[PDB]
Motif scaffolding. Structure first.
Motif, PDB file in Angstrom:
ATOM      1  N   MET B 158      43.544  -2.832 -28.419  1.00 55.34           N
ATOM      2  CA  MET B 158      44.686  -1.424 -28.596  1.00 55.34           C
ATOM      3  C   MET B 158      44.320  -0.572 -28.549  1.00 55.34           C
ATOM      4  N   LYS B 159      43.077   0.405 -29.607  1.00 60.63           N
ATOM      5  CA  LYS B 159      42.707   1.702 -29.485  1.00 60.63           C
ATOM      6  C   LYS B 159      42.117   2.398 -28.022  1.00 60.63           C
ATOM      7  N   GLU B 160      41.745   1.555 -27.051  1.00 60.33           N
ATOM      8  CA  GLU B 160      41.024   2.194 -26.159  1.00 60.33           C
ATOM      9  C   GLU B 160      42.052   2.294 -25.552  1.00 60.33           C
ATOM     10  N   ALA B 161      43.195   1.537 -25.155  1.00 66.97           N
ATOM     11  CA  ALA B 161      44.936   1.210 -24.976  1.00 66.97           C
ATOM     12  C   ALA B 161      45.546   2.599 -24.813  1.00 66.97           C
ATOM     13  N   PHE B 162      45.824   2.744 -26.088  1.00 67.64           N
ATOM     14  CA  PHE B 162      46.540   4.083 -26.415  1.00 67.64           C
ATOM     15  C   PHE B 162      45.852   5.836 -26.518  1.00 67.64           C
ATOM     16  N   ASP B 163      44.202   5.598 -26.340  1.00 65.60           N
ATOM     17  CA  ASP B 163      43.097   6.302 -25.742  1.00 65.60           C
ATOM     18  C   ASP B 163      42.935   6.952 -24.598  1.00 65.60           C
ATOM     19  N   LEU B 164      43.463   6.411 -23.865  1.00 70.80           N
ATOM     20  CA  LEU B 164      43.839   6.235 -22.540  1.00 70.80           C
ATOM     21  C   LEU B 164      45.152   6.762 -21.762  1.00 70.80           C
ATOM     22  N   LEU B 165      45.810   6.400 -23.214  1.00 68.18           N
ATOM     23  CA  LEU B 165      47.119   7.138 -22.816  1.00 68.18           C
ATOM     24  C   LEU B 165      47.402   8.602 -23.098  1.00 68.18           C
TER      25      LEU B 165
END
Ligand code: NI
Ligand code: NI
Ligand code: NI
Ligand code: NI
Lengths: 388, 388, 388, 388
Positions: B158-165
């Motif tokens: 989840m953190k990976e996803a939001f960091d990329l966004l």
């Protein structure tokens, strides 16, 4: 193939748990009080590693400085005689009528100053007894009605309190950390920092966040209908699980404090699985109450039961993770893929990767079953010892 | 002395709310679908400020790039014709079977990459339409069983996803912020980041925390039995309330999405009191469903009701805070003292202050009543318009 | 020492359970539809005793009289080929939009007459197929708001409906009984006759009470936080348990319909204990849904799991009651005394008995511990197969 | 246009309500005890009609026959001096440790006999004081664990107890009726007869059912998440509402006992609507607790608030039902059709009526909207005094 606890298992109990006299909102005590020294002795005989206390469990409210010394010295002697340790201590800021509107966030400023002095005094005592963790449960911080408490001001006051406590332990050179214990309600209509998540968020606003973590309790998160193992995983992920309180709860109702293993048994299984897998190394503390139907024999039976049920679940969870059929089912359900980065190739490669979108076959992906029910029935078979 | 909304009141609605066809887990649609253009028109006539959308509300799943252009152009024309704005947009990552085990935290890595591409595409569209807030509701992120999801790995994902966004919007120079919308359960057995507190804590672990806040929903925190106004106060305190979703819920059960004001009416009163007092200036968004018993006339009646009930509560809360009798009762209950620092004098002066402990008269403090019941009956009288 | 079901175990499933396509309030079907004939075949292979149906599961809504005959004839042939029975049938009065405000208690009188005709038609069909029990689940009888339904008039209408159904089966000479299935909420905001107790009370007001009993469902009573085994005991006591629906539920939230054994595992243990001890001899029916994460392989795995978990619990409960240590603990906790009359000597002897009051030693009685915790840990050891 | 209660309004209070000292499971009393004579006096000044008592509220446990006479005589004198009545009385079978496993269904037979003698003694006292209703709340009848209580035997014992009590009042020629008060949990893990429905069903199995009805409590049914007005309607329908207890509760959690009007305000509105519409003529009894934050001034403020909030809701509900716009909306929602028989023409005419099925236009019926949202917004406007 049995289940006897040893002090290596790090099982601990609060003085207030086996010493609860059975008074509830509708009835009188059904048991006499226990001397702390006897509890320490009985628990040592059962295989426990240590005990915890509120200041007022150990030193009666209103004690002279010398009565205090006497109470502590006898306690210390029982610890020396048994080998028991004191890894955690906490403050009673909820029983005395003076705390009826809270301790750190009472509307009356003079009560808040007094709450901090009562706390600081007990931190010194806890460091002397060797505790490594200082717990805070703000049982009276909250409200029964909307206008009684401005919650932004109360959080300012809560932060003020914890910052000062952190200034104090750093100025004294003490090696002790703090753990906040959330609860959603009871005894106040709604309590502030009601869940593990609210307490984790709060901590990030303190002056020295590294000094503070959480002390979650099974029954407390379940009183909000939440998944306790999920909550613990988030605390572990944040690096903040400094302590944990174990017990049982049957759903959303008053705080039952049943022995560990009672209440939601499958949640207990997945909790033990997670603690042992993540290598949690702190105390396994039981915050529970032997039902008031019981005499002292049932009290010690209930305390033994806590430790027994942890060790049985530990063995079933270890058997589950070691089972090759289970490791294959985890792969079939793609748990291994969950642990791999979504996009270690970086944003630009993802944006340019046509198999991630333009040419992704969404229909074939959707038809893949997750195989979670067979995995879950394997977990059930293992918990019930029905593996065939 | 009436209650007509104006676009100045910043009332907004999702296309999916008044356009819900009435399908529930036990029954068929009871209403035909609405064209987005008609909804925009009807809502403008009712006094609304703007609308919100999921990508799939506006552009049917599987649309060609040109069908897409056509859908958007008609929408844009309806916005030009009415003056309506689009302050928020979001992604549908829960309806298509491909998201059955989640979007950003699905076990299948290829589904997670696809979830991010579907999102990025809609962020560009939302920036083109002028949205300022991008909402994420991970309705499918979670589990029905303990072994199906490792929650520490899923939070990593989840953190990976939001960091990329966040990398993407900063690299594009876009001025848009993200808001995470928590929900404890339904449609998954337990959903990750189940409450406002869990989402606030999570955000502090992102690479650029300042880009993210929360979008709490009345009914969602109440499905966990929590106090929604308390939750909102904590988000305001953290500086993180970027958006809010309003509706009604009768207790702990399935997500009802009743019109705002329905459900727990006193909670609604204290929420409006807090938003107007803290000067919240974002949209007042309604995420609700007209009951499937209704025809289209009842749909528009239900939407009007949302806005009407906010304006009535706004007037009663303003009357409550302006009432001199209420300001005196707040002083009598020591709300003014709650707002003052406990110890601006500092740790050392507190430790040396004997009136904080050695000479504190605990019995006199405890005897002071808090006067909260009269205050609360004044709040009730004002809400019911019974001030005499 | 294994757990294979046989048709002697009387396990039954609804067509709608394994045939649920996975549509939920937030998402599309994830599985194709199943032909009833295939379900009957697959279930027979798993060891099931029979199947149940709603009229609309078997005959598509709006079918011509001849399409109807064709559907029934194929079904009957599958039953002949497999040996499967049809012990229970029921009416779908909740899916079609016409039932949006209920069937028997819809405000529109013409809908209520239609609801009764749709029902009567299916009772004839069920008697032809051999069913012994006709179930009624009034899923749409209820309301989202207080003024929409006068509950005294609606109960009059409900009683009117059931009295007419009883007149019809007695006039036709049919040997079939009715069973009412309670649920507290979902899909209506509140449903009428929400719990086992409300349905038992209602029945006593019918013209021919002996024709009606209850069909309780595990998850439904747990959605009200109630103790399902306690509820079943009251139904057994009243002579009214005519059928039962088994599944799993994790607390108070939307109706999960997990496989039996999932959810509250200890409640499942005490339920099986009670059914086998009281000699309940009807079907063990599973009303459950394989999670939409699953493909057809997970569907059949989930259905097998239901039956497996019942047979494991049956064996652990039988071992518990046969254990001499447990029989001694029951005596120690005075379960034997609970079964004896309080006052078979009669009122006058009790009034004259001074040991019941004037000379009762209340302090000695109060000091007796009930020994319930050791008994409960024995029950836990037996459930976990940890008896040592 | 004000809201002053008169003894004609039939408002009553238990001695234990305003006299609650503030002891809860986590804290000491915050208020001194009240003399029953002072409570009777203060309540008379507030406009109350009468008071109720447990035996132990009025006569301290363990009192000699003469101390007893003295306590009663002073009480009687306060009643004579004020005009207050005593319409209801009840037994304390939950506070003394002897009742830790229950009164009528304790496992120990000698405790059950004692429970009946303690009760019979107080029935005589209540008849002497003029009470018309004798209430039974079996707060300790229940269990924390599955094996501790066989529920079929316990119901046998409960029925035995109530049958004997009915034999006694009929043999003495007393004109008093019994009312059973349900509660789902607290202080026991699960309590027997947990809801209004379970108690109604139980009563139908007594030897003389006509002697018994229910005493439902707002907060108790809400602790199970149930709709209290629906529950009351079923009791009225059965002819069994003999008494009622009013208070406030915020959802599913510990029993809060807030003042009436607090908690779920819309439920309170619909309850008052139903009581006044059905012509309920018994006492309006408040079973509530002034929060322990309060001093005696807040205690009397809280008690006044109970009565004030009933009278305000009474006026808003009366205005709602008298409003011609509301009577037209009720017709538009077909409440009038709900009150007409479905089939006064009889079974045979219904079976022969082709418009009920063969020629029923199901599509046109389904398209009719129920108009419930506008009706509900009219009810909201009236409750908030916002009718324009
Ligand atoms: Ni607790
Ligand atoms: Ni919602
Ligand atoms: Ni269900
Ligand atoms: Ni209560």
């Amino acid at each position: 193939m049995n289940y006897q606890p040893t002090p290596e298992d790090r099982f601990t109990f609060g003085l207030w748990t086996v010493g609860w006299q059975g008074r509830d909102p509708f009835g009188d005590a059904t048991r006499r009080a226990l001397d702390p020294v006897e509890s320490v002795r009985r628990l040592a005989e059962l295989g426990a590693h240590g005990v915890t206390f509120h200041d007022d469990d150990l030193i009666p409210f209103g004690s002279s400085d010398s009565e205090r010394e006497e109470h502590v010295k006898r306690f210390r002697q029982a610890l020396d005689d048994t080998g028991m340790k004191v890894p955690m201590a906490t403050t009673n800021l909820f029983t005395h009528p003076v705390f009826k509107d809270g301790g750190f966030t009472a509307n009356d400023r003079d009560v808040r100053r007094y709450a901090l002095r009562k706390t600081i005094r007990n931190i010194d005592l806890a460091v002397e007894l060797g505790a490594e963790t200082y717990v805070a449960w703000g049982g009276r911080e909250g409200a029964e009605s909307g206008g009684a408490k401005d919650v932004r001001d109360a959080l300012d006051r809560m932060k003020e309190a914890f910052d000062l406590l952190g200034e104090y332990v750093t100025s004294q050179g003490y090696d002790i950390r703090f753990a906040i214990e959330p609860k959603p309600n009871e005894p106040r209509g709604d309590i502030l920092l009601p869940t593990v998540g609210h307490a984790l968020a709060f901590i990030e606003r303190l002056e020295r966040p590294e000094l503070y973590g959480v002390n979650p309790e099974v029954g407390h998160e379940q009183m909000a209908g939440l998944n306790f193992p999920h909550g613990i995983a988030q605390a572990l992920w944040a690096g903040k699980l400094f302590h944990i309180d174990l017990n049982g709860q049957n759903g959303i109702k008053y705080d039952q404090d049943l022995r560990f293993g009672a209440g939601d048994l499958r949640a207990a299984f997945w909790l033990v699985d997670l603690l042992e897998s993540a290598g949690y190394s702190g105390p396994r503390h039981f915050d529970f109450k032997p039902p008031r139907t019981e005499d002292f024999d049932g009290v010690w039976a209930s305390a033994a039961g806590c430790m027994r049920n942890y060790l049985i679940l530990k063995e079933r969870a270890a058997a589950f993770r070691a089972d090759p059929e289970v490791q294959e089912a985890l792969r079939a359900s793609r748990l291994d893929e969950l642990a791999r980065p979504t996009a270690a190739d970086g944003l630009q490669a993802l944006l340019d990767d046509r198999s991630a979108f333009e040419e992704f076959d969404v229909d074939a992906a959707a038809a893949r079953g997750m195989a979670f029910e067979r995995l879950d029935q394997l977990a059930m078979d293992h918990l019930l010892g029905a593996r065939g």
